Design an enzyme around this catalytic site. Structure first.
Site, PDB file in Angstrom:
ATOM      1  N   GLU A 271       2.248   6.920   1.410  1.00 47.10           N
ATOM      2  CA  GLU A 271       3.516   6.647   1.111  1.00 47.10           C
ATOM      3  C   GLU A 271       4.248   7.020   0.056  1.00 47.10           C
ATOM      4  OE1 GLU A 271       1.414   4.077   1.735  1.00 47.10           O
ATOM      5  OE2 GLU A 271       1.385   2.548   0.375  1.00 47.10           O
ATOM      6  N   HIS A 295       6.114   4.251   9.925  1.00 41.28           N
ATOM      7  CA  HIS A 295       5.342   3.591   9.127  1.00 41.28           C
ATOM      8  C   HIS A 295       5.480   3.743   7.669  1.00 41.28           C
ATOM      9  CE1 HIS A 295       1.648   1.337   8.211  1.00 41.28           C
ATOM     10  NE2 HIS A 295       1.450   2.025   7.163  1.00 41.28           N
ATOM     11  N   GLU A 296       5.484   5.214   7.297  1.00 44.07           N
ATOM     12  CA  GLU A 296       5.665   5.743   5.847  1.00 44.07           C
ATOM     13  C   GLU A 296       7.052   5.280   5.310  1.00 44.07           C
ATOM     14  OE1 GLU A 296       2.896   6.234   4.497  1.00 44.07           O
ATOM     15  OE2 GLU A 296       1.531   6.572   6.205  1.00 44.07           O
ATOM     16  N   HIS A 299       7.274   1.793   4.170  1.00 39.26           N
ATOM     17  CA  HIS A 299       6.655   1.736   2.966  1.00 39.26           C
ATOM     18  C   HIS A 299       7.632   1.848   1.707  1.00 39.26           C
ATOM     19  CE1 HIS A 299       2.575   0.533   3.510  1.00 39.26           C
ATOM     20  NE2 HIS A 299       1.970   1.878   3.905  1.00 39.26           N
ATOM     21  N   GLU A 318       0.566  -3.717   4.346  1.00 40.98           N
ATOM     22  CA  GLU A 318       0.309  -3.011   5.293  1.00 40.98           C
ATOM     23  C   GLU A 318       0.881  -4.094   6.410  1.00 40.98           C
ATOM     24  OE1 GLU A 318      -0.088  -0.053   5.713  1.00 40.98           O
ATOM     25  OE2 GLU A 318      -0.697   0.460   3.609  1.00 40.98           O
ATOM     26  N   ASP A 375     -12.473   1.610  -0.818  1.00 40.38           N
ATOM     27  CA  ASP A 375     -12.408   2.382  -0.144  1.00 40.38           C
ATOM     28  C   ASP A 375     -13.582   2.161   0.923  1.00 40.38           C
ATOM     29  OD1 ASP A 375     -10.626   4.324  -1.414  1.00 40.38           O
ATOM     30  OD2 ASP A 375     -12.127   5.582  -2.444  1.00 40.38           O
ATOM     31  N   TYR A 383      -4.091  -4.316   8.013  1.00 42.67           N
ATOM     32  CA  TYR A 383      -2.864  -3.804   9.134  1.00 42.67           C
ATOM     33  C   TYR A 383      -2.506  -4.760  10.189  1.00 42.67           C
ATOM     34  CZ  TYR A 383      -3.366   0.750   6.755  1.00 42.67           C
ATOM     35  OH  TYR A 383      -3.500   1.690   5.845  1.00 42.67           O
TER      36      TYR A 383
HETATM   37  N1  LIG Z   1      -1.168   3.337   2.551  1.00 42.75           N
HETATM   38  C1  LIG Z   1      -1.519   4.648   2.893  1.00 42.75           C
HETATM   39  C2  LIG Z   1      -2.964   4.898   3.344  1.00 42.75           C
HETATM   40  C3  LIG Z   1      -4.198   4.865   2.360  1.00 42.75           C
HETATM   41  C4  LIG Z   1      -4.722   3.594   1.870  1.00 42.75           C
HETATM   42  O1  LIG Z   1      -3.924   2.395   2.371  1.00 42.75           O
HETATM   43  N2  LIG Z   1      -5.585   3.683   1.208  1.00 42.75           N
HETATM   44  C5  LIG Z   1      -6.171   2.454   0.661  1.00 42.75           C
HETATM   45  C6  LIG Z   1      -5.644   1.201   0.751  1.00 42.75           C
HETATM   46  C7  LIG Z   1      -6.364   0.105   0.311  1.00 42.75           C
HETATM   47  C8  LIG Z   1      -7.626   0.315  -0.209  1.00 42.75           C
HETATM   48  O2  LIG Z   1      -8.400  -0.897  -0.655  1.00 42.75           O
HETATM   49  C9  LIG Z   1      -8.341  -1.977  -0.832  1.00 42.75           C
HETATM   50  C10 LIG Z   1      -8.460  -3.078   0.458  1.00 42.75           C
HETATM   51  C11 LIG Z   1      -9.021  -2.643   1.439  1.00 42.75           C
HETATM   52  C12 LIG Z   1      -9.492  -3.545   2.627  1.00 42.75           C
HETATM   53  C13 LIG Z   1      -8.854  -4.873   2.474  1.00 42.75           C
HETATM   54  C14 LIG Z   1      -7.786  -5.287   1.584  1.00 42.75           C
HETATM   55  C15 LIG Z   1      -7.967  -4.085   0.313  1.00 42.75           C
HETATM   56  C16 LIG Z   1      -8.104   1.514  -0.150  1.00 42.75           C
HETATM   57  C17 LIG Z   1      -7.583   2.679   0.209  1.00 42.75           C
HETATM   58 ZN   LIG Z   2       0.446   1.893   5.491  1.00 46.01          ZN
END
Ligand SMILES: NCCCC(=O)Nc1ccc(OCc2ccccc2)cc1
Ligand SMILES: [Zn+2]
Ligand SMILES: [Yb+3]
Length: 610
Positions: A271, A295-296, A299, A318, A375, A383
């Site tokens: 986003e 969705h985007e 955001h 999310e 990651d 979500y």
């Molecule tokens: N939002 C667009 C898609 C990419 C994305 O959300 N990447 C991303 C987000 C959170 C993250 O890490 C934190 C996390 C993970 C699981 C639960 C809570 C927080 C890692 C990558």
């Molecule tokens: Zn998202």
């Protein structure tokens, strides 16, 4: 107490604050580096501020200029996925609210976890290379030094020199293009972002990019070869934007451009303000995956305006966005469709809880990412557990019209701010003060902090789901004497969404007998379908049911695109299938250098290699 971001090594927002970034850099494709200057306007929040700490990862610090001269800096030892701290000695002892510009010259490693550098061979046009960033969650620190926490927001200005035949785009409004003074052969593209954003939303692409008008405030950007297919695919964008403003309030970012990236882009979308990045796996050629655009767009309010203070509270981003997305698709295609999609969401959540295990910490809604690489934690849980909570609450508080009033006001109140679950929940109670008794029937502890499936399931209209269940079940319980009754007419009245949900439901009960899955290909011909959501689940179903002929199909899909949602599970299934295990690993080893760096490290961890 006074919150700390555990994924950042930087000085917190309670000690100092970045208000602005000025970015001058050149994009060197031969060295695969971003070289330049990063000037941070920082503001103290205590008196006697004598030094601050910035986040870095694989960064070459050339010089740190403050007030004209050079200053004393000191990189601490590497701290894993977090990178290395950069403590900076300030020449003046700053006091409350006093600002300062710290100009930091820098080079990025060619193995920057934020960046994928592609050769001409890896693109569509074959004649020009390409670059793209992907800073979320904590990779901005691998392009430049920063407080790499979403608890800090900053405007930014950028100037970037690129080979004269390539186009740069950023997460900002385009501020013109001019020939480069210092050396011809290069343009300098200029950019400005006046709305203060978290650094994860700083973003950059560089390649042989053309554009195309598809709405009053929207151009699609891709390579010649995809531009046309994409204009068709995302035509609905403006109409989605309009609905999003009715739900969210004014769209403040100025432009909403779409960039269709190379097949290796690791998510469905990111986003990035003013320029949303999407996977070319959206290009099904019938607009059927436009929920991702929905969705985007969403955001632009939930995420980019109201932001998770730390990644522990990522569900705010999310959960809300998925809630808005599903409203958008509901307005366009009907309430019964919104319920269809909400129920499928619950199904994805069931798959996540079963995959992690029902006592696993990453199935909690609010998590703790102390010593966890974000990651690696990332999944559908924030979500879909987040959406489920919002959906349950909508039903409990008197329905979507009433809950969307909460939404818009929630967005209005925390706009341009970074917040936690408590800010959200305290505001819920404030808004719904006349229904506090109802709110206190919510098991807040379970929903927020317990692992596994939520303690209550919302109520879902079934209209559109029933046909999927009947057919999923006919297959799951089929015996020899049923196989000849299956027929291509079984799908006569099913949309692509319902084919997908049918395959999702069948996949939950894999393996099916090999003879059954063969029979399914015979009557339905799912091999011919290019819809990536459908092909994905169909090939999982095939591999998980021991169908060797599916092996080359699944390896092809896992390597010719790299959206992790598809790539990771296809690799894992291939590895768990004894017939494909060795070829899965070898295929990984042979592709891993031309893969996106976060995807390569994740697939490697999944395959237990190195
Ligand atoms: N939002 C667009 C898609 C990419 C994305 O959300 N990447 C991303 C987000 C959170 C993250 O890490 C934190 C996390 C993970 C699981 C639960 C809570 C927080 C890692 C990558
Ligand atoms: Zn998202
Ligand atoms: Yb029978």
């Amino acid at each position: 107490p006074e919150i700390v971001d555990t994924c950042s090594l930087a000085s917190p927002a309670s000690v100092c604050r970045t208000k602005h970034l000025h970015l001058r850099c050149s994009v060197d494709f031969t060295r695969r580096t971003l070289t330049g200057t990063a000037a941070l306007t920082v503001q103290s929040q205590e008196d006697n501020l004598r030094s601050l700490v910035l986040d870095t990862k694989d960064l070459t610090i050339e010089k740190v200029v403050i007030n004209g001269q050079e200053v004393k800096y000191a990189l601490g030892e590497r701290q894993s996925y977090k990178g290395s701290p950069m403590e900076i000695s300030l020449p003046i002892a700053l006091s409350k609210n006093q600002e300062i510009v710290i100009e930091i010259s820098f080079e990025t490693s060619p193995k920057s976890s934020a960046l994928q550098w592609l050769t001409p061979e890896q693109t569509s046009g074959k004649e020009h290379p390409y670059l793209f960033s992907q800073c979320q969650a904590i990779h901005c620190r691998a392009i430049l030094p920063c407080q790499d926490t979403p608890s800090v927001k900053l405007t930014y200005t950028a100037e970037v020199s690129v080979p004269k035949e390539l186009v740069a785009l950023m997460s900002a409004i385009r501020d013109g293009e001019t020939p480069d003074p210092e050396d011809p052969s290069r343009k300098i593209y200029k950019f400005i972002q006046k709305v203060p954003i978290p650094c994860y939303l700083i973003a950059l692409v560089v390649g042989a990019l053309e554009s195309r008008q598809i709405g009053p405030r929207t151009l699609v950007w891709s390579e010649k070869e995809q531009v046309e297919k994409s204009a068709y695919e995302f035509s609905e964008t403006e109409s989605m934007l309009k609905i999003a403003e009715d739900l969210g309030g004014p769209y403040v970012w100025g432009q909403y451009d779409l960039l269709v990236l190379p097949p290796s882009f690791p998510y469905g979308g990111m986003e990035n303000p003013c320029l949303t990045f999407v996977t070319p796996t959206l290009l099904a050629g019938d607009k059927s995956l436009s929920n991702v655009i929905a969705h985007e767009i969403s955001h632009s309010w939930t995420g980019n305006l109201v932001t998770n203070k730390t990644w522990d509270h990522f569900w705010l981003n999310e959960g809300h966005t998925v809630y808005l997305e599903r409203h958008i698709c509901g307005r366009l295609f009907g309430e019964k469709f919104r319920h269809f999609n909400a129920l499928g969401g619950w199904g994805e959540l069931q798959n996540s809880v079963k995959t992690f295990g029902e006592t696993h910490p990453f199935t909690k809604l609010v998590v703790d990412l102390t010593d966890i690489d974000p990651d690696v934690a990332y999944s559908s849980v924030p979500y879909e557990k987040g959406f489920a909570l919002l959906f349950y609450l909508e039903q409990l508080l008197g329905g979507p019209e009433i809950f969307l009033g909460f939404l818009k006001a929630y967005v209005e109140k925390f706009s341009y701010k970074s917040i936690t679950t408590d800010d959200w929940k305290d505001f819920l109670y404030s808004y719904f003060k006349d229904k506090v008794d109802v709110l206190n029937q919510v098991d807040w502890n379970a929903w927020l902090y317990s692992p596994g499936l939520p303690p209550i399931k919302p109520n879902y209209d079934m209209t559109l789901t029933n046909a999927c269940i009947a057919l999923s079940q006919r297959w799951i319980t089929a015996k020899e004497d049923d196989l000849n009754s299956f027929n291509a007419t079984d799908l006569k009245d099913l949309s692509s969404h319902q084919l997908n949900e049918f395959l999702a439901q069948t996949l939950q009960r894999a393996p099916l007998p090999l003879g059954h899955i063969k029979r399914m290909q015979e009557v339905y011909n799912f091999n011919a379908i290019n819809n990536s959501e459908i092909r994905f689940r169909w090939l999982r179903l095939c591999i998980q049911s021991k169908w060797e002929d599916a092996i080359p199909l699944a390896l092809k899909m896992a390597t010719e695109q790299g959206r992790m949602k598809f790539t990771r599970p296809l690799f894992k299934d291939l590895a768990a299938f004894d017939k494909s295990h060795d070829q899965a690993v070898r295929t990984y080893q042979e592709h891993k250098a031309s893969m996106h760096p976060v995807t390569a490290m994740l697939v490697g961890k999944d395959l237990k290699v190195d």
